[PDB]
Amino acid sequence: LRLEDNYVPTSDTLVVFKQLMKLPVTVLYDLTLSWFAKFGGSIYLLTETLDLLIEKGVRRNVIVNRILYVYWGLNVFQLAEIDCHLMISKPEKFKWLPSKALRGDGKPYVVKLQPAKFIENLQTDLAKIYHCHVYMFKHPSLPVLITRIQLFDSNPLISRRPYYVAFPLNSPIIFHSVDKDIYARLVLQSISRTISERETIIFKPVQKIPVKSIHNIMTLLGPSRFAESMGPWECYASANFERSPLHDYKKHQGLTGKKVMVREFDDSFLNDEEPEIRRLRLEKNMIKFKGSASRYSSLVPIEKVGFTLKNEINSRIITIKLKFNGNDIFGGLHELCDKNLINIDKVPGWLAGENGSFSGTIMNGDFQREQ
Amino acid sequence: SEQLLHNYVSDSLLTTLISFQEEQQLQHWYELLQARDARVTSELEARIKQFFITLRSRLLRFLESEQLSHSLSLETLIDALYKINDLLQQRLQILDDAIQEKTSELAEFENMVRSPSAGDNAIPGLLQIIQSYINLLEEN
Amino acid sequence: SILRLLETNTVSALDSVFEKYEKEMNQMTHNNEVKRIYSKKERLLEIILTKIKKKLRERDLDIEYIYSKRQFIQNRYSQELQNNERLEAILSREQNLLEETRKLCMNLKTNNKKRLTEKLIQKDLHPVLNKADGPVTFRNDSHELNLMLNDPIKSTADVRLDKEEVLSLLPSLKEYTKKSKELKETMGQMISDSHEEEIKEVFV
Amino acid sequence: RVERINGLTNLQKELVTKYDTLPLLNMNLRLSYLRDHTYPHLQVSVQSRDRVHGIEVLVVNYKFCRNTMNPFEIQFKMFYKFEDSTLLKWEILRISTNVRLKAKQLLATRNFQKCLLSLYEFDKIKSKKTGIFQNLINLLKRKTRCYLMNNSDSLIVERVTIKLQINFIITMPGECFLPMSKISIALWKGGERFNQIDLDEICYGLIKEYGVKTGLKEICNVCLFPDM
Amino acid sequence: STSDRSELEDYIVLENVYRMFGITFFPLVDPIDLKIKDASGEIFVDREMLGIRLEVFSERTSQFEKPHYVLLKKRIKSNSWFLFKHTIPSFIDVQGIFDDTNGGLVISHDDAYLFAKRVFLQLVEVQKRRQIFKDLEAKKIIHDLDLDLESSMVSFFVKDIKVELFVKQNEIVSCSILDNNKSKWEIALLGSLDDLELKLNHSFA
Amino acid sequence: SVTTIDVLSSLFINLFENDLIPQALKFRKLLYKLDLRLFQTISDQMTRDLKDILDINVSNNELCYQLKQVLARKEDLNQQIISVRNEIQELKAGKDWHDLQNEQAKLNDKVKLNKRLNDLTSTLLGKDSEDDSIRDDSNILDIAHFVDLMDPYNGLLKKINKINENLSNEL
Amino acid sequence: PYTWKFLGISKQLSLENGIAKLNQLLNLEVDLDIQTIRVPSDPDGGTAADEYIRYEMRLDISNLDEGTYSKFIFLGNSKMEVPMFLCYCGTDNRNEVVLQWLKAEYGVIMWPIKFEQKTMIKLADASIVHVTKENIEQITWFSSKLYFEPETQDKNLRQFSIEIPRESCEGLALGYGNTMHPYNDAIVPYIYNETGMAVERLPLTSVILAGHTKIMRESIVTSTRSLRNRVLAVVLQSIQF
Amino acid sequence: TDTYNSISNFIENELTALLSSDDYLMDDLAGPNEVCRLLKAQVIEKRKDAMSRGKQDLLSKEIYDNESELRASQSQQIMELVGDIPKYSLGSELRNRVEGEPQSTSIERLIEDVLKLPQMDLKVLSEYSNLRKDLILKCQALQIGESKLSDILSQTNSINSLTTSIKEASEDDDISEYFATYNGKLVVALEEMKLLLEEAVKTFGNSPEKREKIKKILSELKK
Incomplete structure (x- = not known):
């Protein structure tokens, strides 16, 4: 009861039309030749007619008419490829949610999966419960391997919401689509059952608030230099300040010197021109909220963040609970610091943007993210 | 029923x-x-x-x-273990070939440092020179 | 008054076949062409009686379509019932696996407590009871000195180290042993003839 | 005001104008962290540096002075590219004649980083080895006779008779890149040698359980065995 | 200031010679916890920081790579460092190594140097496993290949045959040949990583 | 309720026709009863078809209800299988099972070490030897001693060579 | 949930006269009480323009509904620049009638009152000081929530909200010292010291004492159907020139 | 597999179809039509709930319940048979060798799987025990041979380092003459060094530089 690629599920044609209207002509022509070399139906002489239509400059409704009414849904494989190409094309409308992969003692486990033998084992373990279909591809721009799992049910076979799981190449952190049904738990548990093959793996979730794109969540939690720095420490995750030891020593930072503004340590901010000082103040805000140099949008836009600052004065426990919201939180705080509404010498580390897209209690000045 | x-x-x-x-x-x-x-x-x-x-x-x-x-049965497991036994026998064979190459290198070194002679006489001369050097050093 | 005519015509065909099924044995009295040509007479008698019944008389409720819907419902019922039996078998297998894992964990915990309790009774007084900062300074002095200890042979669960069969499985170890013995004897003869331990000892 | 900090400046003016997360530009404090803390007992001193027209030659010599009695020195000579900075050539001018065969197979990797790190970790490992062995001298000179052997790689104790040899061999890499140590023991009860596998298991257990400095003292306590 | 420039040049080139070792410590202050005393005007740093600079020297291109930074901050109530920030990627368990060193509490500078040495050996073995396969690709013994980020799972071609390796720390632990006779060629290459170069020419002679 | 009225009308018409055929019946006599059997079969099968339509309707409603019950039990079994598999996976990869595993390993190591120590202290005084080399280490020491003897740079011939030239240098 | 709404009054008006015209116009029996309240009963005031006059003017409808019962709390002082103001709850349609009467009988200029940020801080500062009959001031503590809503580029930061629970509020005010102004001498300097965010410059939207009130920039929502003397004193003190 | 449909098809097309067609009106083979139609009318009259199309669905469900209750005992007894080393207890590579097509052969995982298989038709049991003993001996000899190979590789590394060092320091291709005449270069060295001690015994006649000469000798012969 595992489904092959030639099986045709039941689906309305207007939703496949609205899916196909979101693609350019060249990927439609490539999908046409790929499905005709793979499946075919109604060798290369028929494909020579489509070569003139792209060369002439014809409308997209005609070519989606041509691809929808010579395969007259198409099947499960072409639907999976259409939806995956829509994922590649417009990536800022999905929503990913990370989950670390521990094992045994508690040490994390790098996945290192093979995209051929994993799909057979996952489809076999999922076929014992439902009617599954698993289609894995590799992202062209990023080094991830986005799996797409779609479960069917019987009243042909109706289609549920597809469930994506994006494995990075060498990280224990596996992203997946945000879903709280029983099908999300089934697919995630079957993935954690058939990725191991040697010793058992558990998928504990590392974050609760989902992140928007797949470039953003790969910058935050995938294998990258920005996985931990992410804030005012972003000058270390790109090496802006130091050259190689074999480099010239005339153009050294410690020989030319940098231009810095004398800080004020007396509280003379709450009681309140020379555009060198204005440029250095704007550069100081840019240094604090970013690396060293639009103009407010951070490296990763973060939507929802809420801290819990737990200080300790004269044997009391004084909690405050900040809770931010927006489209890009730390760019907005940069803008408020730029209108001279917030003192920049008193903005702490966790507010400037470090440990980005995380939220948790701050005891003794040490951040510790929520479980 | x-x-x-x-x-x-x-x-x-x-x-x-x-x-x-x-x-x-x-x-x-x-x-x-x-x-x-x-x-x-x-x-x-x-x-x-x-x-x-x-x-x-x-x-x-x-x-x-x-x-x-x-x-599982006790016949397919025995065939798989026969295959694994052949694999480990091949591994031990190539390991023994590497050991044979290294001891051939040792045999090539072994005749390079031999000196078939009666060199206890020069050893006694070195001992007498040691006694003379100790006599010249301790009496200074 | 047309669906009733269709049902009466279907029942007429069925009853004509069922009467011909008895006429196949009731035609031995009178011959074989006197029944296949006389069947059209009595079939026209039912065709004229249905014609008179057509003038003696309405939803489109047929028997065959609703019987096909019954067969479809029964087939889907049997499919879902077989799926429930398969999922019952899967759940029974996973429940047995969970019980085996839990009894393994409880048995190993009980064996750990029993072995720790009997370890007190036995004699471990001088070299082991000085600690029983112990196994955590070895990792410091092993990642500090890059220590490679003589790694013992892996656990075989009472299959002892048969050195005869291991030595017979590698026939080059004996040749390496005797070659190393001749090499050590050659180097010892060269060292003792040079008096390295003699003149370096009296000098200092 | 607006100041321009430089490489040589006092720490207070550096800390007044500090709003970035960059390293401190004070070169004396930075050289103090590079010299006293991360690489102690090492005397690096650049001897000369010239240039051509586009490359920059650099002669620097090191003196690994962790052993104050007889330290070994080395002297390098490197050739830059000085923009799109690669390393064209590097050659060794003089080696003090103590590590010369040990740094013979090591110094053919054509990787100066591995040779520098391997020489520093080798002298650190040799200092730790002679410290552990001298600690075993100082706690056994009154009960046993204890003389060293080979160069320093195997301490030998003897009592009553019974002998015990504690090997400590440092193997330089060649045909990982850091030098590794090997500890093995061997007993003699007067007559003949014991089983090497049981002694290896006892040594592995007593070092995996106790340590290296306090682990071997337990091995000498078992090889005594007059009391327990 | 014309002799102070020469003194600064000597200090900078001595810093570069020390940075050639690979593992270096550099001073840090956090701009949040710089506090004034208000009785003398002098500025003291509240929580001490110490950063580690791990910069592996490549050999195939003969130039230093992008440096990896690890920054430790001193805990305010324990006097022991904790792993504040690090730019070491996620396939190296840096917090696991920092909890493994000295039990979990790092006090002295050599206790941090052991941690730096462990993460540096992991970075060097990743660089070496990448460089060996890239130098195999440069000599046309293997065809166009794909690598992982740590190059622990490669799939290169031979003249006809496709070979898949799962390679551990400078030794091959799992070979895979796909296209009785295949098993001998699979356990042939199952060895070290330079012996793989010795073996892939042993079949194409 | 047109099915009951159609049943009554068809039964009355076919019963009058069958009574007429029975009165006509009482090919000498074997011809008349064929139409009688045909009329009886028509009446019986027509009332059977109407009863079958009613019974099939109520049976299909009952079967649809029981199929809904079986689909509910299918969802129940799905949730039960998923929860049991989750507890299985959180049992083998837990801290307690791994902790008792390492405690068993440490107890086995301590037992084997103390057994070997007791046998060693036994063969010292109360109540082994070597005859073959299966794992030996007494060979690399002699070779290291020979290499440090015949070193052409430091050696022992060159340590004297840096003394006799240094003896005439003090003259 | 009695959303008060504030206006201003240009001339100090006594309502002993004209209330017969209001009873003529609305055919009801509206009531007054002439209180001479006194804010800051602590003796460190000097008694220099300290007494206020409060005209609570209820529309005497029964309490069968809550929107039909709409108070009109006046307050005034004949020593300031802007002498009076008025605040009214409810959503009854006689409110426009009595505002029209107050305009067309006395000839006064009314304007709606919009609060600043420090006025909202001083309003949450005085909406917790409970009154006692033993001429001493006590403080109840509430879990406040300062709700912000800025206008950034691209709507980067939409709305954020500091929230302080009750016990930490009490601990902050006791750690500052003996005062009757917690939110202006303990809480807001603490938030500025620990987060850097100057609250009197950030765009405050609604200070929400949990359960008790909900101050806004134009209105005030209150749990009970009356306002204290210190809240109205702060409101009248804020709109001066 | 699909036993309910077979039960219901048996009930419908073998039980009711035979008790309705000729079991009621075709009983006149031993017989007029009026009494047969009277008895058939009485039979179909006083029976019209047992052979319905909705009661036999309930009887089919009851027969399925009986056969499922009998299948439950057989399924819970078919797992408690003679097990004979089942799955989920062997290693990964062992149960991949069972199903065939492993596609990736390893030696470390095979060793960790062979050293994990349990111990114990009786001749097949003895054959499996002998094979387990043989494979464990293969893994033991593999580890011993690997350790001895690493030791002999380090040994040849030091030997080749010595030979390369003497070939570079000599540059004359006289390695065999070097070891044989090493005694000859040492007997002329200590004999010539005794002439230097004779020239330093009673010629300098010092007492303060003698300590410096002794320190230089004892620090050049040892450091």
Whole structure:
């Protein structure tokens, strides 16, 4: 009861039309030749007619008419490829949610999966419960391997919401689509059952608030230099300040010197021109909220963040609970610091943007993210 | 199983309403009637009996063909262990070949540092020179 | 009054076939072409009686379509019932696996407590009871000195180190042993003839 | 005001104008962290540096002075590219004649980073080895006779008779890149040698359980065995 | 200031010679916890920081790579460092190594140097496993290949045959040949990583 | 309730026709009863078809209800299988099972070490030897001693060579 | 949930006269009470323009509904620049009638009152000081929530909200010292010291004492159907020139 | 597999179809039509709930419940048979060798799987025990040979380092003459060094530089 690629599920044609209207002509022509070399139906002489239509400059409704009414849904494989190409094309409308992969003692486990033998084992373990279909591809721009799992049910076979799981190449952190049904738990548990093959793996979730794109969540939690720095420490995750030891020593930072503004340590901010000082103040805000140099949008836009600052004065426990919201939180705080509404010498580390897209209690000045 | 089918069959015959409405000219009918209504419940009781033996053996041989896809024998495991034994014998063979190459290098070194002679005389000369050097050093 | 005519025509065809099934044995009195040509007479008698019944008389409720819907419902019922039996078998297998894992964990915990309790009774007084900062300074002095200890042979669960069969499985170890013995004897003869331990000892 | 900090400046003016997360530009404090903390007992001193027209030659010599009695020196000579900075050539001018065969197979990797790190970790490992062995001298000179052997790689104790040899061999890499140590023991009860596998298991257990400095003292306590 | 420039040049070139070792410590202050005393005007740093600079020297291109930074901050109530920030990627368990060193509490500078040495050996073995396969690709003994980020799972071609390796720390632990005779060629290459170069020419002679 | 009225009308018409055929019946006599059997079969099968339509309707409603019950039990079994598999996976990869595993390993190591120590202290005083080399280490020491003897740079011939030239240098 | 709404009054008006015209116009029996309240009963005031006059003017409808019962709390002082103001709850349609009467009988200029940020801080500062009959001031503590809503580029930061629970509020005010102004001398300097966010410059939207009130920039929502003397004193003190 | 449909098809097309067609009106082979139609009318009259199309669905469900209750005992007894080393207890590579097509052969995982298989038709049991003993001996000899190979590789590394060092320091291709005449270069060295001690015994006649000469000798012969 595992489904092959030639099986045709039941689906309305207007939703496949609205899916196909979101693609350019060249990927439609490539999908046409790929499905005709793979499946075919109604060798290369028929494909020579489509070569003139792209060369002439014809409308997209005609070519989606041509691809929808010579395969007259198409099947499960072409639907999976259409939806995956829509994922590649417009990536800022999905929503990913990370989950670390521990094992045994508690040490994390790098996945290192093979995209051929994993799909057979996952489809076999999922076929014992439902009617599954698993289609894995590799992202062209990023080094991830986005799996797409779609479960069917019987009243042909109706289609549920597809469930994506994006494995990075060498990280224990596996992203997946945000879903709280029983099908999300089934697919995630079957993935954690058939990725191991040697010793058992558990998928504990590392974050609760989902992140928007797949470039953003790969910058935050995938294998990258920005996985931990992410804030005012972003000058270390790109090496802006130091050259190689074999480099010239005339153009050294410690020989030319940098231009810095004398800080004020007396509280003379709450009681309140020379555009060198204005440029250095704007550069100081840019240094604090970013690396060293639009103009407010951070490296990763973060939507929802809420801290819990737990200080300790004269044997009391004084909690405050900040809770931010927006489209890009730390760019907005940069803008408020730029209108001279917030003192920049008193903005702490966790507010400037470090440990980005995380939220948790701050005891003794040490951040510790929520479980 | 059969105790339900026998009730369903013998509760639906001419043995349910004819024993209530029951000289000899009307007696030869309903005697031969229920006797020929006993021929149907004989050949069909053998039909419902033979069906469940056909049904349960088709279910038992299915269940025995499902457990042996999760259990192992002592013949395929022995063949797999023979294959693994051949693999480890090949690994030990190439390891022994590498050991043979390294001890051939040792044998090539072994005759390079030999000196077949009677060098205890020069050893005694070195001991006498050591005694003379100790005499020249301690008396200074 | 047309669906009733269709049902009566279907029942007429069925009853004509059922009457011909007895006429196949009731035609031995009168011959074989006197029944296949006389069947059209009695079939026209039912075709004229249905014609008179058509003038003696309405939803489109057919027997065959609703019987097909019954067969479809029964087939889907049997499919979902078989799926429930398969999921019952899967749940029974996973429950047995969970019980085996839990009894393994409880048995190993009980065996750990029993072995720790009997370890007190036995004699471990001088070299082991000085600790029983112990196994955590070895990792410091092993990632500090890059220590490679003589790694013992892996656990075999009472299959002892048969050195005869291991030595017979590698026939080059004996040749390496005797070659190393001749090499050590050659180097010892060269060292003792040079008096390396003699003149370096009296000098200092 | 607006100041321009430089490489040589006092720490207070550096800390007044500090709003970035960059390293401190004070070169004396940075050289102090590079010299006293991360690489102690090492005397690096650049001897000369010239240039051509586009490359920059650099002669620097090191003196690994962790052993104050007889430290070994080395002297390098490197050739830059000085923009799109690669390393063209590097050659060794003089080696003090102590590590010369040990740094013979090591110094043919054509990787100066591995040779520098391997020489520093080798002298650190040799200092730890002679410290552990001298600690075993100082706690056994009154009960046993204890003389060293080979160069320093195997301490030998003897009592009553019974002998015990504690090997400590440092193997330089060649045909990982850091030098590794090997500890093995061997007993003699007067007559003949014991089983090497049982002694290896006892040594592995007593070092895996206790340590290296306190682990071998337990091995000498078992090889005594007059009391327990 | 014309002799102070020469003194600064000597200090900078001595810093570069020390940075050639690979593992270096550099001073840090966090700009949040710089506090004034208000009795003398002098500025003291509240929580001390110490950063580690791990910069592996490549050999195939003969130039230093992008440096990896690890920054430790001193805990305010324990006097022991904790792993504040690090730019070491996620396939190296840096917090696991920092909890493994000295039990979990790092006090002295050599206790941090052991941690730096462990993460540096992992970075060097990743660089070496990438460089060996890239130098195999440069000599046309293997065809166009794909690598992982740590190059622990490669799939290169031979003249006809496709070979898949799962390679551990400078030794091959799992070979895979796909296209009785295949098993001998699979356990042939199952060895070290330079012996793989010795073996892939042993079949194409 | 048009089915009951159609049953009554068809039964009355076919019963009048069958009574007429029976009165006509009482090819000498074997011709008339064929139409009688045909009319009886038509009446019986028509009332059977109407009863079958009613019974099939109520049976299909009951079967749809029981199929809904079986689909509910299918969802129940799905949730039960998923929860049991989750507890199985959180049992084998838990801290307690791994902790008792390492405690068993440490107890086995301590037992084997103390057994070997007791046998060693036994063969010292109360109540082994070597005859083959299966794992030996007494060879690399002699080779290291020979290499440090015959070193052409430091050696022992060159340590004297840096003394006799240094003896005439003090003259 | 009695959303008060504030206006201003240009001339100090006594309502002993004209209330007969209001009873003529609305055919009801509206009531007054002439209170001479006194804010800051602590003796460190000097008694220099300290007494206020409060005209609570209820529309005497029964309490069968809550929107039909709409108070009109006046307050005034004949020593300031803007002498009076008025605040009214409810959504009854006689409110426009009595505002029209107050315009067309006395000839006064009314304007709606919008609060600043420090006025909202001083309003949450005085909406917790409970009154006692033993001429001493006590403080109840509430879990406040300062709700912000800025206008950034691209709507980067939409809305954020500091929230302080009750016990930490009490601990902050006791750690500052003996005062009757917690939110202006303990809480807001603490938030500025620990987060850097100057609250009197950030765009405050609604200070929400949990359960008790909900101050806004134009209105005030209150749990009970009356306002204290210190809240109205702060409101009248804020709109001066 | 699909036993309910077979039960219901048996009930419909073998039990009711035979008790309705010729079991009621075709009983006149031993017989007029009026009495047969009277008895058939009485039979179909006083029976019209047992052979319905909705009661036999309930009877089919009851027969399925009986056969499912009998299948439950057979399924819970078919797992408690002679097990004979089942799955989920062997290693990964062992149960991949069972199913065939491993596609990736390893030696470390095979060793960790062979050293994990349990111990114990009786001749097959003895054959499996002998094979387990043989494979465990293969893994033991593999580890011993790997350790001895690493030791002999380090040994040849030091030997080749010595030979390369003497070939570079000599540059004359006289390695065999170097070891044989090493005694000859040492007997002329200590004999010539005794002439330097004779020239430093009673020629300098010092007492303060003698300590410096002794320190230089004892620090050049040892450091």
